[PDB]
Amino acid sequence: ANSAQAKKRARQNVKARKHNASLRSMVRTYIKRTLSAIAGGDYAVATEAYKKAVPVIDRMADKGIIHKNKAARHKSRLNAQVKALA
Amino acid sequence: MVVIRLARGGAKKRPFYQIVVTDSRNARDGRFIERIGFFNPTAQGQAEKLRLDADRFAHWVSQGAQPSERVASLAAQAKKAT
Amino acid sequence: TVRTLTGKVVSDKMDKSIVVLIERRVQHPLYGKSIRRSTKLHAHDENNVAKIGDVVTIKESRPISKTKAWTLVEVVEAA
Amino acid sequence: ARYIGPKCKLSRREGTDLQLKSGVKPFDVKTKKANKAPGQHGQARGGKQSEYSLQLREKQKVRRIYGVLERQFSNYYKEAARVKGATGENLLKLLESRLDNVVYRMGFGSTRAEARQLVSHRSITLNGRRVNIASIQVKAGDVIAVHEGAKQQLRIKNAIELAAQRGIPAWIEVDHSKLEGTFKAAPDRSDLPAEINESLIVELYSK
RNA sequence: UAACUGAAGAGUUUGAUCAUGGCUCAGAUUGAACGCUGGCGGCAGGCUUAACACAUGCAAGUCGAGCGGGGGAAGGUAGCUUGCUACCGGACCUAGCGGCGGACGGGUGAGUAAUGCUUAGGAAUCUGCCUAUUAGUGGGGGACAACAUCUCGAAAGGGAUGCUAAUACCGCAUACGUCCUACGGGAGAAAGCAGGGGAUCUUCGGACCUUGCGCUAAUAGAUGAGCCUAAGUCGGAUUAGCUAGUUGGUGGGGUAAAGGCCUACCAAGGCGACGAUCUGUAGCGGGUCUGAGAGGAUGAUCCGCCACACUGGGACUGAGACACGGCCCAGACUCCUACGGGAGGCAGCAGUGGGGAAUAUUGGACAAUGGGGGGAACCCUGAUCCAGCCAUGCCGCGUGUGUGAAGAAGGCCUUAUGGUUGUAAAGCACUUUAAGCGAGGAGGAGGCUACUCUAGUUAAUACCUAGGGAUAGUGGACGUUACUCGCAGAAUAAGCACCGGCUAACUCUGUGCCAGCAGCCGCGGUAAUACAGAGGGUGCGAGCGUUAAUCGGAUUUACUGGGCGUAAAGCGUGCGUAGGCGGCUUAUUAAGUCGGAUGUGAAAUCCCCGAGCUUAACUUGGGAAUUGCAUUCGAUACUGGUGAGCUAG
């Protein structure tokens, strides 16, 4: 970087990268937990996992970490797979 | 945004402006959406000095176009004249 | 209000997919003689009604696969 | 650039009076060497010429009286060919519409060179404005007057009295007392001398 | 009114001739170069070669009305070595956090024969700032730069401990819209700052009211971008088979979004003589040059699209990048070093080296038009507007005008005295364009501030917003502007090519197949109109010639528009595949063909009629044109399809 503002932009970039990466890993972990419950196959367990996963997905969608279309797709597909367990 | 502004043409020391509606990110004398008049600051004799299409101006302003200072002054002067 | 083409089927092996041959007649740009040209278009046929040799109509639609963007409308003549 | 030099050899080569001198003396008494070409190998008028020689010799004669060079003359031809009408008639109209020629024919200058000098030295006004370009095209209904400082010139008074010997043309009306004149319209071919042939120029430039 | 009107040949094969057929010449044009010469102005253009390497300066900042610190000026108050000190409130400045911008504007054409471009359409998308409308902006918490200490390094810059503010960050509460839904229900936000103030209170300094700028959720509009389809878009067969995520399907994953985009299975498909695969070359279009047209060549300067940023591979932040002057990695190269450690990318503007036949200043201002930030004041802007250099091009002007012959002098030729230079010169009388000197002097500036008035919002006259009026200030880099008026005196200002024919313009000297000229045919071997000089003349003219390149002439690739007995050219002769073409009558279809309507065919460019430049170049208003494409409605003579019938093949 040649200019002070460019250097400042790089600094803010690395900070924001760290913060966003942590927030995105959280959503990935919760979706993984719901998928594991689905694989386990108990309807109540899968329902609890889905009910715990949904608020985190919506919160991180509202912050711009992920797109709201992606959040809606995740919610719909997970709900369908849970309902499949009867 | 969308703006209404002046694009320069003519010869050296004798500018002649077209009044254009365009995206602000475009180059001054490049891509534009619609041309709605002209301005000649040094008109002489029988030459017209300012033509402006008031209905198109109003229609584009109603959609959120932002005139520049010079274009707004010219529009006010044209409305005063006619 | 939708673009349609009329052709003849030249293949039906693929599942839910048919290949139809379109033909057109144009004048040569320089020498003026009328020339015939052919185009092979993949189409979507959900119920495998079409077979080799029938005359079919197809209409433009959104992509279905890598190479298919047209869908069958009706069978005009049977083989 | 304008031609400068001897005018009588110029006229002798073409064989006809080109009106390049004031005219206080006739051409024959002026030169004494007419019908002889300027060169030592110069011969009589009866020398045979090819068609290419004839077309060239006519165009040169037409250029030499008006004092126009080749670039401007070719531009004149190209404009006359574009304008609808007879090409030769249009070319003659364009040549006779120049400001210096109108000043000469109005009698404020003894010769076209005098008229050109007067126009260039800002001694002429066109429609009330002092101009200095000899090739300005004069339109119908114009007013050419002598500038105030230009007035009371002995050369101008000699020019007007000399012009009195000739005939003031139809399209130009002059108040010589006020040094003022009014071009009305472009001469038609009948007014101009009939010895000039323009067809030769036409195919020469349309080759 | 108008928008077009357009076509020339010559030389050369032979002792003549006609034909065939090449070669050469006369035209237009240029981002040109070189030789000789050179006065001015206007308007344009200016590294086509090394996408070769780069010294140095500039080309992206702004906001204290988001925030905490920290500085240095003044002032006021106190004292007194008396004009010095110490204290206190306001006015200025900004290293850091934070917001917006940096994805625009500018450069280049390496790569790319189709993921690109052009024309016409489509559905499954997102979109900061702008416009309209709807619902809100409640209450908490934990941190980290700055700062302080220590430490490494000459530094440049690094590292480690302890604090701190916010429109930085994260829970909780609430939800007109919004998301999911099994239709029962469940889920998800935000931030404050500034101006003014009547009354009231003020736990003592604000609350409260109001108006702006903000922030959150959502729907439309506009703008921008992503995706898909059809038809077009340069050669090569001395390149004939190519393809296994390959072609299709199902489950799942993934994207803003359709989709083998990815993945696990199932099947064996997909492309190709209408040229697949391989290979050479190349940015594409509007346009430009040429041509009677059809065509051919081309893609500088202007505009649209695409791609690239020392060479390759990636991702982050963000509404938007896989980002020229951002980050990471690998490679080559270059630089500083105290050897500890570091740094860099002109195909941005100017400029250097190198290459080349060849292409310019290390300039001025943000006054104008735009762009970024800001409430404003204002700051930034090598975009831009201007200036400098170059006859590179186009257009215009000047280098003087009239008179002046028993034809001065001098030069050249000669039939030896005439001819010619030539009115040319001298002499006589005049004029002052442009350049030079002096004086005056538009327009490019709309506006802003000050004053006053009116109308909105309010509780308000305050503040803010929108308007009106007159006056006064302030605002131009170009610039000693354009333009106008005075002074001087012809005074400051012409070259280049050619004269056997093609092709306008002829003699004498000098040399003798020598020296030399030459586009083709050809000149020179003692009378050279063709070599060199001189006299004379011709053509152009601040230019004139040569070389290079494209089209034309070339009907010399012939679609318009050519040929094959002997000039070049019928396969040695059959059969036959793909293909091309195909007898008569009738009914029907409307693919070819023809007609109407609608939409589109950007602007600029070409042409026509006008307007403004003292004229012209040039600029500009409105038309005409863009010969095309798509959709839709009609006609049925001919061609094609289908049904029926016939016999001359």
From Swiss-Prot, chain A:
Disulfide bonds: none annotated. Keywords: Ribonucleoprotein, Ribosomal protein, RNA-binding, rRNA-binding. GO terms for cellular component: cytosol; small ribosomal subunit. Coiled coil: none annotated. InterPro entries: Ribosomal_bS20, Ribosomal_bS20_sf. Binds directly to 16S ribosomal RNA. This is Small ribosomal subunit protein bS20. Belongs to the bacterial ribosomal protein bS20 family.
Curated annotation (Swiss-Prot), chain C:
Keywords: Ribonucleoprotein, Ribosomal protein, RNA-binding, rRNA-binding. It comes from the Bacteria. This is Small ribosomal subunit protein uS17. The keyword DNA-binding does not apply. Part of the 30S ribosomal subunit. InterPro entries: NA-bd_OB-fold (IPR012340), Ribosomal_uS17 (IPR000266), Ribosomal_uS17_bact/chlr (IPR019984), Ribosomal_uS17_CS (IPR019979). GO terms for cellular component: cytosolic small ribosomal subunit. One of its GO terms (biological process) is translation. It comes from Acinetobacter baumannii (strain AB0057). One of the primary rRNA binding proteins, it binds specifically to the 5'-end of 16S ribosomal RNA. Belongs to the universal ribosomal protein uS17 family. GO terms for molecular function: rRNA binding; structural constituent of ribosome.
Curated annotation (Swiss-Prot), chain D:
GO terms for cellular component: small ribosomal subunit. InterPro entries: Ribosomal_uS4, Ribosomal_uS4_bac-type, Ribosomal_uS4_CS, Ribosomal_uS4_N, S4_RNA-bd, S4_RNA-bd_sf. Residues 97-159 form the S4 RNA-binding domain. The keyword Zinc-finger does not apply. Keywords: Ribonucleoprotein, Ribosomal protein, RNA-binding, rRNA-binding. GO terms for molecular function: rRNA binding; structural constituent of ribosome. The keyword rRNA-binding applies. GO terms for biological process: ribosomal small subunit biogenesis; translation. CDD domains: S4 (cd00165). Residues 23-51 are annotated as: Disordered. It holds the Pfam family Ribosomal_S4. One of the primary rRNA binding proteins, it binds directly to 16S rRNA where it nucleates assembly of the body of the 30S subunit. Belongs to the universal ribosomal protein uS4 family. Part of the 30S ribosomal subunit. Contacts protein S5. The interaction surface between S4 and S5 is involved in control of translational fidelity. This is Small ribosomal subunit protein uS4. The lineage of its organism: Bacteria, Pseudomonadati, Pseudomonadota, Gammaproteobacteria, Moraxellales. The gene is rpsD.
